[PDB]
Amino acid sequence: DVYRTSGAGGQHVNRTESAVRITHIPTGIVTQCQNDRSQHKNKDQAMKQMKAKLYELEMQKK
Amino acid sequence: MRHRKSGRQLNRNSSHRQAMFRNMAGSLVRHEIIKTTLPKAKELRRVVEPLITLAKTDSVANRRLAFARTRDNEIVAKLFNELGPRFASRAGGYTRILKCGFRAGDNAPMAYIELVDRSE
Amino acid sequence: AVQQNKPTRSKRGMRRSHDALTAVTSLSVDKTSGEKHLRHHITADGYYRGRKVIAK
Amino acid sequence: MIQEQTMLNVADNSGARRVMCIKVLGGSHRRYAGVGDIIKITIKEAIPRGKVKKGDVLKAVVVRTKKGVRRPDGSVIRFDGNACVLLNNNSEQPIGTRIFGPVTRELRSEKFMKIISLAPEV
RNA sequence: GCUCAACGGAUAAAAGGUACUCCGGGGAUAACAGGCUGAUACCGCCCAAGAGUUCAUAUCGACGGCGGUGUUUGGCACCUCGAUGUCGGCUCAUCACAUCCUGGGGCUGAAGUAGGUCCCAAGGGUAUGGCUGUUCGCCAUUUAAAGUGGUACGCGAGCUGGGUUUAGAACGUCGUGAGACAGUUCGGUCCCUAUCUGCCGUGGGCGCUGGAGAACUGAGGGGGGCUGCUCCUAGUACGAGAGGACCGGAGUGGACGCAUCACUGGUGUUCGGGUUGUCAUGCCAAUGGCACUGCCCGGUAGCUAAAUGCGGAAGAGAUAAGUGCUGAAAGCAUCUAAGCACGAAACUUGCCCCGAGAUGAGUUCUCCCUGACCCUUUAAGGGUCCUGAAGGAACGUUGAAGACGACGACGUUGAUAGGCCGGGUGUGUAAGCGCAGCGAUGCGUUGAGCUAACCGGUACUAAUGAACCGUGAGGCUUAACCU
RNA sequence: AAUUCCUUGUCGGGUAAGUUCCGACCUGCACGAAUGGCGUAAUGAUGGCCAGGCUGUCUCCACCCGAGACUCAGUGAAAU
RNA sequence: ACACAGGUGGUCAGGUAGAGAAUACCAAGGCGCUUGAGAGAACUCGGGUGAAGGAACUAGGCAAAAUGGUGCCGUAACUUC
RNA sequence: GCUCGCCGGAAGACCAAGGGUUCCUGUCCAACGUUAAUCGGGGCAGGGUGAGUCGACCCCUAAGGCGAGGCCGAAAGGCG
RNA sequence: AGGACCGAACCGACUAAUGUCGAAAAAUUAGCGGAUGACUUGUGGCUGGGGGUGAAAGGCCAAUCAAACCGGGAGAUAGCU
C-alpha cells in the first residue's frame, strides 16, 4: 500500500511525502517505513522490518 | 411561484399594509374621491366595496363590524346614513377607477378613484 | 472581476442599441374638449370620453 | 418510515426493551423501512432475565410505525410509537412467542404466519 | 622571523540565531503543478525444467530477455519568485478501459449448481456509518457491484479551514546561550458588484427577393439506457446422496428521472377562534393597536413532498468475441480467399423533447393588395398628392404566463379582472337580548355568526369608437405550354 | 503522559464498529522532586470523551413573512 | 475627511404590571431615520413553521432548539466540612 | 388640519466641555443636500446675547510647574 | 462580612453570522465575562525614542512600533532593478 502524508511550513508551502505500508494477510502485521525519501528504498527498509517482524513471530512460536 | 394567488404586497408588511387601507378607506368615504397610485387604487376596491356591501344591511352588529374595521365613528356616521341608503339598488361596483397620469415626483401612475354616485 | 482590456467605442455603441426610447403614438383628442390626451387617461382639465368627471 | 439510528420499542416477550436500527435491509442505499420490512438492529436496552442481552446484532421485522401504512382505498393506519419483532438473523424465525400489541394486515405474507397467529389484534 | 586557516595572501587582531522580521534582486536557483526522460513503479508478451496424481499448455512458473503506459518515488532546471497563493472534506462533475457488477462467449481436472482463467464490451449504475485532520487504511453492516486512473495528486474570483505553514504558550530532547527539531500539543481574518470566452435560459433587429395568419415535414442535436427477489416452466435435465439448471412468462420491490395535487400530510404573518400584559374609544360591554403573527390551536387556494400514477423496453438492421455452412488455393482437411447465415446493456434506429438562421433559409392551406403625375444618371429609381388593405402593434382588464421582454385569453358584437348573489370550504354556538346563578359563568335564541386565492351565474365598475405601423399585383435568364 | 520515535504498543471497559476517551502493565527513543514531584475540594466564555433532553445541523428539503435582487423615474461611482 | 448605524461627562427621569432604572404598552415631549413607485424570478441576508427519525451532519452538537419565575418538597460521590 | 406607526432611565427636556452666529425673520434656488425642493444648519440682508444673588474673574490651597538668593553643571541648563 | 452568587447601568470582548471599494481605516445583530472591587470614569498634572511604560505580548507611546513623528546631514550608499 502506498499513501501520502503532509509536511511542515513557514509561510504557505505544501510538501507531500510518500509513505509505504506493507500488509501481510497471513499474519495481519502492518509495517510502514518513512525512514528514507525514496519510494523504492523505503519499501525495502519496510521489507527489512517486515521480514524482521516475521522473523520475531518465528522466535515466539519457537 | 404565485400560481393562482391574490392580493398585492405593495412593498409593505402585513401590519402596515392592513393599517394602510384602513386609513385610506376612511379618507375615501370622506371626500368621495382621492388621488393615489394605480396599483394602490386597484387593491383599495377590495376593501371599501365590501364595507359598502355591509352598509346596505343596517343593524347593530353590522355597525360594530363597520367600527371593527376602519375604527372610526365619523365613517360609520357617513355610512348607514348616506352611502348605504343611496346604494341600495347598485348591485356591486360602487367605485370607479380613472387613470389621471404620472406623478411628477417619482413618475408613478397616478389614478383618481371615486364613488360611482358622487351626485354633485 | 474586471475587464482584461478596454472595451472599444464600437462595443459600447452596440450595447446601447436596445437602449433607445420608444414613441407614444397613442394620442387621442377628447370628444367634447378635443385636448390631446393619452389613451385610457383623463385629460388635463379632468375630461374623459366627453365628461368632465373631475370638475377641476 | 424507519431509517438508520432509529430507536424502536419491542413488541415481543424476548426480554428486549428498546432497540436501534443500524441498517435498513433491502436494496442498495435504501432510505426507509416500511412495516413489512426487515432491518438489522442492535439491543440498546433489555431485561435482566432474558433470552437476549444488550449488545446483540440480529434481524427484526417492523410491525408498528407512526407513519403507518396505506390501504388500496387510500385509508391509512396511523399508530402511536414504533414497534418491531425480533427474528433469528440466520433463520429469520421469531424469537419470543407473545406479542404485546396490534399489527397490520400487510404482514400476511406467509413468511410471518406465526406473527399473525400470535397477534392479539388485526 | 611572525604570518598569511581559504596557500595572488580583503592588515598578520574576528563565532551563532531569526517563523518579529525588513530592503534591494532571481524561475540565472529550490517546494506544488506543468514539460522532457522512464532508471523505479505498473501492465502486457518470449523461452522454460519443475511444483503439479499420469501429463507444465489445467494455470503458476523459478533462472533470464524484449517492449508499452506517463497513474508512484525520483533525474534535469525548460516555464512562472513586479505571486501559478492550499492537503483533505462538501457540491458538481467529465473522459479513457487495463471491467467491480449486469450482458455475449472459449476451456476445464465446471458432473450438477456454482466457480477459476482468458477474449469482446463503457450503455447505465458504481454504499451507510465508528476511529483519524485525512488521502489511505482498519472494523461493522449491507449490495446485483460497493472498479482502476486522467482531468494543476479535477473543482477554494463556489463553500469550509479541521491538518500544515505568521505573531502567544507549554513538554521532551539538543545547545553555555539566543533558538532549533525523523518531534506533539492548546488558541489562530480565506478578499473581489463579471468587460470577454464558455454555459443554462430568454428576447430585439434583419434576412428567407410580395406581405400576412397558422399547421407540419424534417437534416441535425440532446435526454433516456441500472437491477434484485419470489413463483411458474419443473422442484425437470444432470446427479451416488445432498443439492438443483439454460430458455421463455407472470408478479413484486430498491435507487433514479418525469409529471401531478385526486388521496395521506407540511406550509398557508391575506381566514376563524382562544388567551396574557397594556393603551385607546368617557365607564361596563364590544372591538381595534402593540409586544417575533405577542404566544398559540386549527385551516381554503396555491406551491410541495415523505404522497399518487408512469417510464427504463420489446422489436429491427449492421457488427464485436465466438459458433457456423459450403469450399478451393493445397485431389485431403479447413468458417474465407468469392459467396451465405446467426451473433452483446455496445453502433444506427425504435421511445421523448428541441428543431427550416438546415443563409442548402423547405412543404402545404388560407387571406389581401391590379391609382394619376412628373424628373427620368432612362432605374428592380426617387419625390408629391390620392389611397393605406390582410394582419400586427400600441393602449387597457388580466392569466394555474412571467425576472424585463416574450407567450395565452378578452376588449361592450363582453364574463378578462374586480364587485355582488348563491353554494362550497374552513373555523366552532357571534353581537344584542331573555333566563338561571352570590359570582365567575352557563343555558336558550343558534352548527349560528364570520368566511382571503374555490365553483356556478350576473355587465354594477373599468376594458371607448377610432387613430399608428403595414400598401397599390411582386426582377432578370432559359425552357416547357396557349395565341 | 501537554513528554512514548517505533506505535492506532498489549490487555479491561465503553459502541454494531473507538488512531481520541477512561483504568493497567512498564519495553521511560528522550519523566522526576522549588527548571518543583505526586495528588487535590471549589472555580473556569478552558482542552479531550460519553449519556439524557432537545431540536431542520443531517437523511432531504418544502412553504410562507420582510430587505435586496428585476423593471420604471432622478442622481450617479470604483478596482482594472 | 462626509448631513457617517460609532464615541462623549453631570442633572431630572412619571402611570399599569413588575423585585427592579430589566422588560411590554403608554404620559410630557420628540420623531417616521432626506430617494421613491411597481414586481413578487433564481439567488443572498434577517426570521417563522414542519410529517417520520433524532447528530445518522461535522474537525467538533458551531449554530439553532431546548431549559428558564415564585413557594414548598427533596438532594449523592467527594470535601479544605 | 384629520388619521396611522415608533422611542419613551430614550430617538425626551436642561447644564459643563467644545465649536463659533450654525439662533430668529424677510428673501432667493445655479452651486451644497447622495433624488426633486417654493425646504434647510445653503447664498444675501437686517435683528437677537441685558445679572450684587447663576458661572468665570476674586480670596485660599492639592498633585505638580516656575522659582530671588543658594548648590551643581563644558555652555545650554538641572534641583530647589 | 465577602477581589461571594444571579443580574441592568457601566466596563470588557469568548462564539456565530453579516460586513470586506462596509454605515464604520475592527463595527453591527443575537447570545456571553465582571458587575462593592486587583472596579470603572470625568478634570488637571508627571515619566519620552534606544528612552518612557509594561499583572511581560516585545504589547502601547495621537489610526503609524524588533524601535514614533518632523527637519537636517543628504542628491547618503546601491557590484542590484
Which residues does chain B have within 8 Å of residue C41's beta carbon, measured at their own beta carbons?
Answer: 99-101
Extract the C-alpha cell encoding C16.
446601447
Q: What are the sequence ranges of the domains in chain C?
A: 1-56
Burial of D104 (C-beta count, 10 Å sphere; 0-12/13-18/19+): buried
**Residues paired with D104 in a beta bridge:** none
How far apart are alpha carbons B40 and B110 in whole angstroms? 9
Q: Is residue B98 within 8 Å of residue C49, measured between CB atoms? A: no
How far apart are alpha carbons B77 and B74 in whole angstroms? 5
Q: Is residue B7 within 8 Å of residue B14, measured between CB atoms? A: no
Question: B40: number of CA atoms within 13 Å, CB side?
Answer: 21
Q: How far is CA D50 from the centre of its chain?
A: 18
Q: Is residue B116 within 8 Å of residue B90, measured between CB atoms? A: yes
| CA nearest to D12, candidates D47, D57, D54, D48 | D47
> Which nt has its C1' nearest the CA of B17?
E270
| CA nearest to D100, candidates D80, D78, D115, D120 | D120
Name C32's Cβ contacts closer than 8 Å, sequence gap at least 6: C47, C50, C51, C52
Query: If you search the block for the grid coordinates 376602519, which residue do you land on?
Result: B70
Name D89's Cβ contacts closer than 8 Å, sequence gap at least 6: D40, D57, D58, D59
Give chain B's domains with CATH numbers. Answer: 13-115 (3.90.1030.10)
Q: What are the sequence ranges of the domains in chain D?
A: 1-122
Extract the C-alpha cell encoding B22.
384602513
Q: In b/e form, how buried is each residue of A30-41, taking b as 16+ CB within 10 angstroms?
A: ebbbeeeeeeee
Extract the C-alpha cell encoding A16.
507531500
3-state secondary structure of A7: coil
CATH, range D1-122: 2.40.150.20
Resolution rounded to one decimal, in angstroms: 3.3
**Helical residues (DSSP H) of A1-62, grouped into ranges:** 39-61
Extract the C-alpha cell encoding B48.
371599501
List chain E nucleotides near protein: any atom < 7 Å from a Cβ.
Answer: 19, 31-33, 40-41, 72-74, 85-87, 126-129, 133-138, 140-146, 153, 157, 163-166, 182-183, 192-196, 203-204, 253-255, 263-264, 269-270, 281, 286-291, 293-294, 301-303, 307-308, 394-402, 418-421, 430-432, 449-454, 458, 460-468
Pairing assessment for the beta strands D38-46 and D16-24 based on DSSP bridges? antiparallel
Which residues does chain C have within 8 Å of residue B99's beta carbon, measured at their own beta carbons?
Answer: 40-42
Query: Quick one: closest CA in C to B35, which residue?
Result: C54
